[PDB]
Write a protein that binds this ligand. Sequence first.
Ligand code: GDP
Ligand code: GDP
Lengths: 260, 261
Amino acid sequence: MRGSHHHHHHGMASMIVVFVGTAGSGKTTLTGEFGRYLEDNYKVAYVNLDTGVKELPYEPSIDVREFVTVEEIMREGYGPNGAIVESYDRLMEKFNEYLNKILRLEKENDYVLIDTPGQMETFLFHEFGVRLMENLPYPLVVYISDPEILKKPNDYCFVRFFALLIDLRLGATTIPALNKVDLLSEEEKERHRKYFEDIDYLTARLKLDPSMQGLMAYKMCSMMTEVLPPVRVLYLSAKTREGFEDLETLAYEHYCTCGD
Amino acid sequence: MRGSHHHHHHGMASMIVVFVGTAGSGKTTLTGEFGRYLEDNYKVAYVNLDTGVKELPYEPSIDVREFVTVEEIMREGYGPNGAIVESYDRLMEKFNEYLNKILRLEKENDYVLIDTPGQMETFLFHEFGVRLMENLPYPLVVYISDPEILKKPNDYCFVRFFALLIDLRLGATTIPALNKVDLLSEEEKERHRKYFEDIDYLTARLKLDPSMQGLMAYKMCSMMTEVLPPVRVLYLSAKTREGFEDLETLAYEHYCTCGDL
Ligand SMILES: Nc1nc2c(ncn2[C@@H]2O[C@H](COP(=O)(O)OP(=O)(O)O)[C@@H](O)[C@H]2O)c(=O)[nH]1
Ligand SMILES: Nc1nc2c(ncn2[C@@H]2O[C@H](COP(=O)(O)OP(=O)(O)O)[C@@H](O)[C@H]2O)c(=O)[nH]1
């Protein structure tokens, strides 16, 4: 219930779930709503690593905006994109402090949801993101995409390889997912699934592309067979909780598999 | 010379150079300073597609900030990142007009230098970036990195695979490049060189690392070998002009290569 105070057993690993996605895919919404969902049964904590966001749909236990905001930095005459980078250079000075707060949380909660910088590139190309991720115990990364970017076959290969890239970069199990599935006509929904679920089929459609660019993508589906096999893409809705049971199951499974 | 009014033969294709890189990599400075270098000998045009840049070191022929800014939109109550996405959603209403203006520029100039949104992901994930790139004639993408992220062998893989991802998403030849090389000791420069361009010494190297990450890096890195005949890499300085000739040459090679067929 909203008023439940769920108990976490102190000598027990929590589940850290980290949401990553380009600006606008629904990171902050998914954290809040997946949080609510879990709160029926679990002790959840919320970490906001995003210095830009104007308002939160959840009460954070940790909030980097308490320390500095993009808006504050822009007051110093920085442009927005400059203020965003500058904001993570400043937080980096306080790295251990935040690393240790997050680690504390992980001892005190069943779940810790991390809502990452609004721009995925801050998290992936700045020292703050990767150094945090190196230092967290088996964090589970949910990489979400707006389905509206899936307009041609090689987009499906794009998203899949980007998740792999994220998994390389952050050194964490990355789950590729779609958000905003609430908006998907069911034809749209089955297309996406077929391309994602049927890599023989995907590969074949990419075979047809005559472009110089098409050949490379068709080829790039070397992912498979001898290592790199396509993992199931999750379909989520942060508005309706479609896929929340899935996500929760996956996150528990990942949790059982780790600590081994 | 720079003050010359260079003549471009209308029936003669130009070189379109697109600077892409994460925010802070030096996109805007590189675009400005490379153009100034080019301006001695060619007729250059500048396109700014970044709604969130405060000042330009160059005079743009095209400036999407004249339609809207991230800052203007934030005054509406959007956060920075909300406004960045919004600025480009609104920009889409003016898509053909921008496309057509740029298409004109390429008929009228030797070089069109395009300075992309400050957040790379804005360009890579937004319809405005993808469709523009789709509609340009053989643009050459230059993907710059800050050498500071290059700390261990796995990082070199990450950054070269990324470039590959840009190629694939944007459907254009993409040159992995380092910017800010002026800040590098000669010792630093040489480390970057053996890993960063030489991808037998990278692969080889990743192969020795028996960890999960090293394994996967090794794997993704070999897939690159078979996926493209390793491009030439660039070591630029937007500040001192190091690598400009090399960039200029690679552009000309790309130009001839796209010429015949
Ligand atoms: N219909 C629908 N809208 C969503 C969903 N997730 C997010 N949104 C909306 O998409 C916009 C971007 O969401 P936001 O959470 O800020 O994404 P962020 O930049 O990654 O943090 C907001 O207006 C959300 O209300 C979803 O699953 N379905
Ligand atoms: N030392 C050095 N600094 C650079 C170079 N290029 C850019 N910078 C600096 O890095 C900061 C980011 O430059 P900017 O063009 O705004 O990067 P952008 O966000 O990708 O457009 C600026 O303060 C530049 O002066 C370079 O080649 N060398």
